[PDB]
Amino acid sequence: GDYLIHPEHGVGQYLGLETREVLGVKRDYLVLRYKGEGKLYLPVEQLPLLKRHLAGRLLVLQAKRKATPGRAFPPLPEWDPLVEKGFPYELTPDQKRALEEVLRDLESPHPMDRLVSGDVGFGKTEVALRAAHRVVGHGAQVAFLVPTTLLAEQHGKTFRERFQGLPVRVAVLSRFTPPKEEEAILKGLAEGTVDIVIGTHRLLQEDVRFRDLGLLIVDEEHRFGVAQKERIRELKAEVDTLYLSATPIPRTLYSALVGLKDLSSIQTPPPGRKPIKTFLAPFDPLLVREAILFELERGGKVFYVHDRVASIEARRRFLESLVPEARIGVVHGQMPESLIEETMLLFAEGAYDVLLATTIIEAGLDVPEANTILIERADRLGLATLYQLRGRVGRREEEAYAYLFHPPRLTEAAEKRLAAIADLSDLGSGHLLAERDMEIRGVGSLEVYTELLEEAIRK
Amino acid sequence: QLIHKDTGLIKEDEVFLGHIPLMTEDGSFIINGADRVIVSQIHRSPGV
Amino acid sequence: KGEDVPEPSVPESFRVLVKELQALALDVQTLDEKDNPVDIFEGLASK
Amino acid sequence: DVPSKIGTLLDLSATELEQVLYFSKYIVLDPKGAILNGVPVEKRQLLTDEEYRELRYGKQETYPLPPGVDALVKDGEEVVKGQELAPGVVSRLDGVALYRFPREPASILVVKARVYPFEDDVEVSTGDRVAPGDVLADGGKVKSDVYGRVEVDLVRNVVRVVESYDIDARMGAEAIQQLLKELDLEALEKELLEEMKHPSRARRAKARKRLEVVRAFLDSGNRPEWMILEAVPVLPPDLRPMVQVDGGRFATSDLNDLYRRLINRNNRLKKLLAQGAPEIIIRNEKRMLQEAVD
DNA sequence: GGGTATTCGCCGTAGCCCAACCATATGG
DNA sequence: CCATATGGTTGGGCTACGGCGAATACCC
Numbered sequence: 001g002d003y004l005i006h007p008e009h010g011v012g013q014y015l016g017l018e019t020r021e022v023l024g025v026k027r028d029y030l031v032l033r034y035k036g037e038g039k040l041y042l043p044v045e046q047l048p049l050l051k052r053h054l055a056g057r058l059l060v061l062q063a064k065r066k067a068t069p070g071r072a073f074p075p076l077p078e079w080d081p082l083v084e085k086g087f088p089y090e091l092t093p094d095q096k097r098a099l100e101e102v103l104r105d106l107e108s109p110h111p112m113d114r115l116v117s118g119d120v121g122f123g124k125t126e127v128a129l130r131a132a133h134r135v136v137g138h139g140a141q142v143a144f145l146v147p148t149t150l151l152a153e154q155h156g157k158t159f160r161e162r163f164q165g166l167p168v169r170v171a172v173l174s175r176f177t178p179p180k181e182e183e184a185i186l187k188g189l190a191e192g193t194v195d196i197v198i199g200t201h202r203l204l205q206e207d208v209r210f211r212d213l214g215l216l217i218v219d220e221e222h223r224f225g226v227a228q229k230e231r232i233r234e235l236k237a238e239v240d241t242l243y244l245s246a247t248p249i250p251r252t253l254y255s256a257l258v259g260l261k262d263l264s265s266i267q268t269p270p271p272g273r274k275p276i277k278t279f280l281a282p283f284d285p286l287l288v289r290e291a292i293l294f295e296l297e298r299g300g301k302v303f304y305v306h307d308r309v310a311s312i313e314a315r316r317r318f319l320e321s322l323v324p325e326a327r328i329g330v331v332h333g334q335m336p337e338s339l340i341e342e343t344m345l346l347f348a349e350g351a352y353d354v355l356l357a358t359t360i361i362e363a364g365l366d367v368p369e370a371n372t373i374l375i376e377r378a379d380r381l382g383l384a385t386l387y388q389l390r391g392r393v394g395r396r397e398e399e400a401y402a403y404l405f406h407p408p409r410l411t412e413a414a415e416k417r418l419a420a421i422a423d424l425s426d427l428g429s430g431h432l433l434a435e436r437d438m439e440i441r442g443v444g445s446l447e448v449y450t451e452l453l454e455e456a457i458r459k
Numbered sequence: 460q461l462i463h464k465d466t467g468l469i470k471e472d473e474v475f476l477g478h479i480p481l482m483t484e485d486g487s488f489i490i491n492g493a494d495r496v497i498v499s500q501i502h503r504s505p506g507v
Numbered sequence: 508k509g510e511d512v513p514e515p516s517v518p519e520s521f522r523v524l525v526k527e528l529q530a531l532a533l534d535v536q537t538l539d540e541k542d543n544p545v546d547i548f549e550g551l552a553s554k
Numbered sequence: 555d556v557p558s559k560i561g562t563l564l565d566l567s568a569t570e571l572e573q574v575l576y577f578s579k580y581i582v583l584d585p586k587g588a589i590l591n592g593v594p595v596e597k598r599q600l601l602t603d604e605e606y607r608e609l610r611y612g613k614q615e616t617y618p619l620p621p622g623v624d625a626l627v628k629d630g631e632e633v634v635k636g637q638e639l640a641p642g643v644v645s646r647l648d649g650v651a652l653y654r655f656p657r658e659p660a661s662i663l664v665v666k667a668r669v670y671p672f673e674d675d676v677e678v679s680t681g682d683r684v685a686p687g688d689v690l691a692d693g694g695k696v697k698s699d700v701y702g703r704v705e706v707d708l709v710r711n712v713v714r715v716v717e718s719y720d721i722d723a724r725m726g727a728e729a730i731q732q733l734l735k736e737l738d739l740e741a742l743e744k745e746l747l748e749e750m751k752h753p754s755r756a757r758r759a760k761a762r763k764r765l766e767v768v769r770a771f772l773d774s775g776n777r778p779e780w781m782i783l784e785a786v787p788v789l790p791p792d793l794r795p796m797v798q799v800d801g802g803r804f805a806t807s808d809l810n811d812l813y814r815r816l817i818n819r820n821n822r823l824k825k826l827l828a829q830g831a832p833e834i835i836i837r838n839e840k841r842m843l844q845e846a847v848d
Numbered sequence: 849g850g851g852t853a854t855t856c857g858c859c860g861t862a863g864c865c866c867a868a869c870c871a872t873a874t875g876g
Numbered sequence: 877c878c879a880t881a882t883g884g885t886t887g888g889g890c891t892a893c894g895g896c897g898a899a900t901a902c903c904c
């Protein structure tokens with residue numbers, strides 16, 4: 001009759017002692033009642049192994065800030081040549097058009113709310129680079145809630161690659177960020193002596209205080225979160241919003257998003273490009289042997305993905321038993337930042353040869369030398385992730401080879417999904433119409449929206 | 460009583476194992492509202 | 508209309524059987540008595 | 555259907571057409587004067603892809619050795635099978651040998667190749683295949699004496715030639731159709747009559763059945779190649795009526811699903827051949843194509 | 849090698865899984 | 877005081893005989 005606590009199974013209620021029976025074995029038991037008549041007979045040798053004792057609110061908020069101007073932006077047309085010098089490359093005229101388009105959306109007193117899309121690998125950073133430079137040109141802070149902390153690290157590397165001649169105080173807050181640096185950055189932008197922040201949603205869950213809520217540029221909201229989309233809405237009180245989410249939500253918001261988000265896609269985003277020479281098969285290890293021979297011939301890098309449902313280092317040893325030539329390394333999650341950044345700088349070193357990830361969030365890096373990608377688990381993947389793997393490898397002046405494997409050759413949803421993947425030819429808007437079909441399946445209302453549009457002007 | 464021989468762990472429970480159709484008073488069965496019955500089956504006896 | 512019902516020409520079952528056989532990569536040659544290849548479809552669905 | 559009429563004509567078994575129609579072994583078209591491990595090859599011949607490669611590219615064995623150690627064989631040297639090519643590694647086959655990394659080699663290949671040192675120009679280029687007794691280099695002085703593909707060597711001034719055959723064998727219904735294009739039924743009928751003149755009643759009955767089938771091919775006026783399909787017809791859609799029942803479902807003939815799978819696999823393999831894919835998935839996709847049309 | 853059975857042998861007869869991220873506790 | 881083990885958060889996506897015959901067996 002005690003509120004005992006088993007160290008393994010939590011709650012327990014003391015009932016007495018039992019001299020119960022085993023197969024001819026006389027060991028004794030102390031007995032515990034659990035939740036719903038769980039009568040565990042623990043042997044007495046465990047004597048020290050026991051202890052004693054809704055959304056329409058947010059909808060009308062969204063329609064309010066849609067109806068609300070908020071703030072205006074001056075152009076400042078002299079600062080941007082200075083940092084515009086800092087990238088020695090040409091700008092696509094479609095991209096330059098979308099740049100000036102979203103910047104005139106910034107300069108209006110209405111909230112800037114756009115989405116530039118296009119087939120990836122073209123410097124979607126650069127429009128955000130010069131927009132953020134104009135925003136810090138007026139002293140306003142720049143935030144970047146990122147999909148992956150790896151992409152946060154790479155984006156901070158690119159930002160510091162641009163912010164050499166600027167006194168811009170950049171920072172990255174994540175789980176991977178060390179805690180002294182975490183609360184030091186929380187302090188530094190809480191009083192605003194840190195200018196531009198990147199990171200995952202510790203930025204959104206540790207209740208940080210901001211200093212200028214002007215520009216919010218978020219990418220890849222498709223895997224951010226639905227209630228975390230509402231968390232974005234909590235962050236987005238009277239702000240100007242940019243989404244570089246070329247991969248959208250499956251029309252559960254993107255149906256209504258058309259119309260009030262002026263879709264600002266660009267075509268032929270990069271010139272000098274190559275069609276991704278994809279293939280598809282079931283699994284075969286000799287094909288992997290020939291493929292890694294191909295990539296060591298061209299001297300390139302290899303991504304390799306997995307399901308993470310088990311350990312991946314045993315699979316890695318199996319591939320090394322297949323190929324004892326290259327140097328294969330796993331970038332599995334649930335490791336400290338030391339391990340992850342050591343793997344990142346070793347693949348920057350490149351003595352390690354095959355990046356064995358398990359997630360696009362584990363592998364959303366624009367590594368240049370990669371031109372070979374192989375997937376075992378393409379059956380259990382959403383289409384957006386799949387083409388994000390496809391475009392996530394890809395560099396100038398180089399072909400690319402993709403090897404996606406079907407274990408059953410039979411799952412009809414994934415069969416037609418991989419079919420409408422494999423219809424690809426090259427870059428340019430095929431992802432957009434593919435997303436359109438996926439969003440047709442995504443919905444598969446305007447009436448309440450006509451109601452809320454009416455009352456939002458009254459509010 | 461899930462009983463491991465070695466560690467003596469006796470996880471005792473009262474599990475639920477589905478439903479068993481009950482005979483009516485007169486001897487029928489009520490399956491999905493339909494009135495059904497079971498007929499005996501003769502066969503060869505076992506043995507030698 | 509109140510007259511005698513007339514008599515059909517090419518059989519409906521005949522026609523669908525010819526098209527099923529032509530579906531099986533098998534030409535079937537409907538002949539007269541003097542080996543003139545007679546059409547039963549009147550060039551309706553044939554180029 | 556037993557007996558297989560294609561196998562009845564082209565003199566095979568059901569297992570062999572199963573092989574060549576599901577890409578298990580090659581079958582030849584012209585022997586081109588090749589050989590198979592001592593016995594020459596003939597028409598309508600099974601051939602593994604191992605043997606296909608061996609008669610096309612051949613058996614080349616490369617060997618490791620102790621690092622920084624000079625071998626008994628020098629660069630571009632004739633090797634006898636059984637030779638101590640290394641300080642300690644015995645030979646395996648017959649051909650000429652090449653080093654990898656001196657200082658004094660690190661590894662050494664040997665190949666099925668003849669060598670002929672050229673002084674003047676070469677009359678051919680690399681990759682050219684040529685029968686014996688035909689000229690190769692030095693204005694015709696260096697000449698081909700083995701069946702093989704030529705590799706020039708301006709470094710050592712040696713026209714070598716890796717000894718291989720140019721036999722054409724294929725794996726497919728295209729190759730079966732190719733063989734079906736090449737059947738004179740007349741001498742076929744005549745030699746069937748000659749087997750009728752033989753006593754042996756079993757071979758007499760087999761030739762009798764083959765003769766009756768080929769006489770049917772004579773009188774019916776048909777190319778046997780028309781047994782192979784190249785453009786499959788598509789039924790009227792109403793005869794496969796995919797219609798909407800009241801429950802929202804579609805009462806659907808399975809022929810629509812069959813046509814869909816065929817169109818999917820066919821256009822997929824068109825796209826696959828459109829890029830020049832590696833051949834393994836090409837073979838697997840043609841396997842699935844024959845499976846689908848089956 | 850032709851002739852004679854032969855004997856089997858098949859032909860016909862609406863629920864989870866897993867991934868990343870943030871949090872608390874917890875050990876050097 | 878700093879650095880992991882494990883918790884729980886949301887999200888993303890996903891499932892047996894008639895019976896002709898025939899290679900074969902048996903025979904001369």
Ligand SMILES: Nc1ncnc2c1ncn2[C@@H]1O[C@H](COP(=O)(O)OP(=O)(O)OP(O)(O)=S)[C@@H](O)[C@H]1O
Nearest residue numbers: 090091092120121122123124125126269270271366
């Ligand atoms: N003006 C430009 N024109 C063409 N390519 C550019 C330009 N600026 C940058 N790039 C390239 O675009 C790439 C940027 O990396 P990516 O992330 O792959 O492209 P992104 O579109 O910015 O990001 P995504 O679309 O989310 S993958 C780099 O390889 C740059 O070299």
